[PDB]
Ligand binder design. Structure first.
Ligand SMILES: [Mg+2]
Ligand SMILES: [Mg+2]
Lengths: 253, 253
């Protein structure tokens, strides 16, 4: 029995490991450049801004920070995905149990513990913005600690689903973070970890086109830093016609 | 019917698109830094060098170049993977037909056509090192052209499996390239696209550990640039015990 190809890739391969280390190398160099030369804009979009003409919450004199998604961005949910592979199960009740009892089965995303330590040695505050539930803040704090990612504090450096009434939408929390910090880098494994504009409607092919809108494309590896996730979530959608465009079809002999 | 999760991710998602654009943004900035300040070492390992103490073919006065894997690094093999998803088939005869007849069903990896044009505008020679077969050089040249990747020439900027007697091992071709160019960046989707030392023996867990050997880890996003591939190849290996380590297991209630 072998696990699903996506988990073999994400959890088992050196390919995925190298991909993640590249992401954090680029982030560390970017942060270091902006620690020496503070920017005028943060990397968080302003309220009402669109992807075509992005405007950003200004950096100002606010303390420097970096924002991170938690799950499959800085922390691997190994125990949970093991159970999903064993069971074949989108199990919301199981995920709730996992938020409460998974602190002993998490690992850092390759390079994320070293990157988080370097950021703090540079004087940059490490802020987590995750859709784990607010009522599970304390076990989530302990899991973050167990992955070697340091100390997170609910409401100061850790923001969770249910901290506002926006549900899985993260823009509201992003606005709260950007109102007190100059956010000079932002990491995630899902497009919703950078803007809610990618979700809540857009099709699979529309979301992929939107990442190549030039004013948005310039962010990738240059303020917005992406970690791989072919195991669950927004990337795992679309029928044959959205995945394989009709001008690129072919059949073997 | 939906395609395999890995193909939904790689071919359909904006997540994979953003991940690829980040890789090429980091590569472009790296190349530009080295065009201004030529390095002493290339990014290609010297003969007999090990991953723990890497030595590199020197840059010297040789003309500047960047080396790229072709398949799923700069070119998406959309037609072929469509057929694999339709058919469920590791089909070596089908892949041979595809090398010969697939030029009309390929697309650039997101950002790869723009990156290849920028490299040439910077005066950097774009060299391809692929395990497509030497006897299919001409259709491979045409497919590279159709993906918007420019003009490749067998034996000058394009090196193929069978150009030497080493089979799928790419070190021999890497040595030939590094003997005439100063290779300042190298891109790939498989660890064999950077060194043969990752393959031919090492286990799934050994290969992943090897990417974090510190002298090697420093390469990722800093000379060695990685593109995602959870669809086929070296990343899709390993049983449950290699993918989900035994100190990170968990079971739902
Ligand atoms: Mg996540
Ligand atoms: Mg390849």
């Amino acid at each position: 029995e072998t696990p699903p190809a996506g988990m073999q890739y994400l959890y088992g391969s050196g390919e995925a490991s190298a991909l993640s280390l590249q992401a954090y190398q680029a982030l560390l160099a970017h942060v270091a450049a902006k620690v020496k030369v503070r920017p005028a804009d943060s990397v968080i979009l302003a309220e009402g801004a669109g992807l075509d003409d992005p405007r950003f919450v200004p950096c100002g004199a606010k303390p420097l920070a970096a924002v991170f998604d938690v799950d499959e961005t800085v922390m691997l949910n190994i125990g949970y995905e093991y159970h999903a592979a064993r069971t074949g199960r989108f199990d919301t009740a199981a995920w709730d149990a996992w938020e409460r009892t998974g602190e002993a089965a998490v690992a850092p995303v390759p390079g994320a513990d070293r990157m988080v330590r370097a950021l703090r040695q540079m004087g940059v505050t490490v802020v987590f913005n995750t859709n784990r539930a607010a009522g599970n803040a304390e076990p989530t704090v302990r899991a973050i600690k167990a992955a070697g990612l340091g100390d997170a504090v609910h409401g100061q450096t850790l923001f969770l689903s249910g901290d506002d009434a926006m549900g899985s939408r993260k823009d509201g929390r992003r606005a709260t973070i950007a109102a007190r910090y100059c956010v000079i880098a932002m990491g995630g494994d899902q497009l919703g970890d950078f803007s809610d504009l990618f979700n809540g409607g857009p099709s699979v092919t529309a979301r992929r086109a939107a990442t190549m809108q030039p004013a948005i494309a310039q962010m990738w590896g240059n303020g917005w830093f992406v970690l791989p996730n072919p195991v669950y979530g927004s990337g795992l959608k679309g029928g044959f016609d959205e995945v394989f465009p009709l001008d690129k079809r072919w059949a073997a002999p």
